[PDB]
Amino acid sequence: MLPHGLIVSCQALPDEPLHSSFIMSKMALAAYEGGAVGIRANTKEDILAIKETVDLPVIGIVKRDYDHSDVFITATSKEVDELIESQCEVIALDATLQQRPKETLDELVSYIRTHAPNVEIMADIATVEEAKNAARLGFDYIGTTLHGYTSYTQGQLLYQNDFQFLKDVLQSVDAKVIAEGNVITPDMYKRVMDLGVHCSVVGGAITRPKEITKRFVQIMED
Amino acid sequence: MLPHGLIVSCQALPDEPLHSSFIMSKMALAAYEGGAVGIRANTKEDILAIKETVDLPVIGIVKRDYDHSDVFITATSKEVDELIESQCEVIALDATLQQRPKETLDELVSYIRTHAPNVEIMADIATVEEAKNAARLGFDYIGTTLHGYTSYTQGQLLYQNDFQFLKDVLQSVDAKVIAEGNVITPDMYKRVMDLGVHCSVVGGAITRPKEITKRFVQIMED
Ligand SMILES: [Cl-]
Ligand SMILES: [Cl-]
């Protein structure tokens, strides 16, 4: 199981400065030495590289665009198969009811339970009712990952109105909730943990120096 | 580093019914599936078996009796060398002021820091002054393991006077404190965590069916 505490997302997509399975493995080692209790990683190759540097539990995803689908976080059984091969402790996937390229959410959950019975599953959701649906499907973890990053939640951010969306998710499900998306400061991390999330995923604020640099530069431009 | 939460001690000495590297590896798997954040294990053979079964961090010891010494938890460099080979994340040793068979406590600490710099060390102590001495030697974790199990702490037990000893250890050192020794109920586990220990080690109450059986039988004999 994932402990209580800080999960560090070690991701760099193509054309990002730190894009490299090797570099993400070193970012994961840094997070481990810093006192992270887990890693979130993208693609089989990054996950396998990370598993050579740290023994921390890994939340695995495959970000891959499909034609005629807005679902890109572990969209089909192809991505699930890669993550089963990766041996990541948790498989995370988009858990919205948006049109998928192949299998439905229900079919992907069943597929993982059948072919990988020792792996836990995490629902990346954008709405309270998506979180409720994920809890009903028996997801081990429910993340706020896609809140503000779907066409129907545009302009919304996790921290808005003292984390009201997170408070609503926590009240609606008894499953372990993960604060993920726009946790950019230790103060924000403390708040979501005090509100009663199981753990919190921090990415950009630790592993995206471009994003951190922009925050420093922006204070002078206000 | 060790997360916050429950560490399960999976030990069975030669005289015990479950004495087996294989059985202790399955006890460790059971602990992992139950939501343990770490394992405490005894001997290289048990540790290697556990570390091929689960990726949980392992606190390694070697219990071995020596002539003309009351120190038996990782007594000499021989035991330290076995634990270095085991690749356990944390090396625990008796951190009492008691004379050791070969190297002193101070010598063994220096030995581990030199020969295994990526390994954390845990002090099994009996007294507040031993906890303070462990902090002086730069121990990563300080456990209450030997409190009541030395010639100079006879009649003392961790839970006595609402864990007064644990309270005294916690306010004496800034290092991460581990509640270990006679933590035998969830109620005790909750209490020591509420008092602000980093984590707690539970052994016999989970992994010694003989000791659990005795507690069931004893309620009818009072
Ligand atoms: Cl970056
Ligand atoms: Cl037993």
Author numbering:
A (entry chain A), B (entry chain B): 1 to 222
Authors' description from the paper:
The third step in the sialic acid catabolic pathway is mediated by the enzyme N-acetylmannosamine-6-phosphate 2-epimerase (NanE), which catalyzes an inversion of stereochemistry at the C2 position of N-acetylmannosamine-6-phosphate (ManNAc-6P), yielding N-acetylglucosamine-6-phosphate (GlcNAc-6P). The crystal structure of NanE from Staphylococcus aureus, which comprises a triosephosphate isomerase barrel fold with an unusual dimeric architecture, was solved with both natural and modified substrates. NanE is essential for the growth of S. aureus in media containing N-acetylneuraminic acid as the sole carbon source and has a highly conserved active site across both Gram-positive and Gram-negative bacteria. Based on our structural and kinetic data, we propose that NanE performs its epimerization reaction using a novel proton displacement mechanism mediated by the substrate.
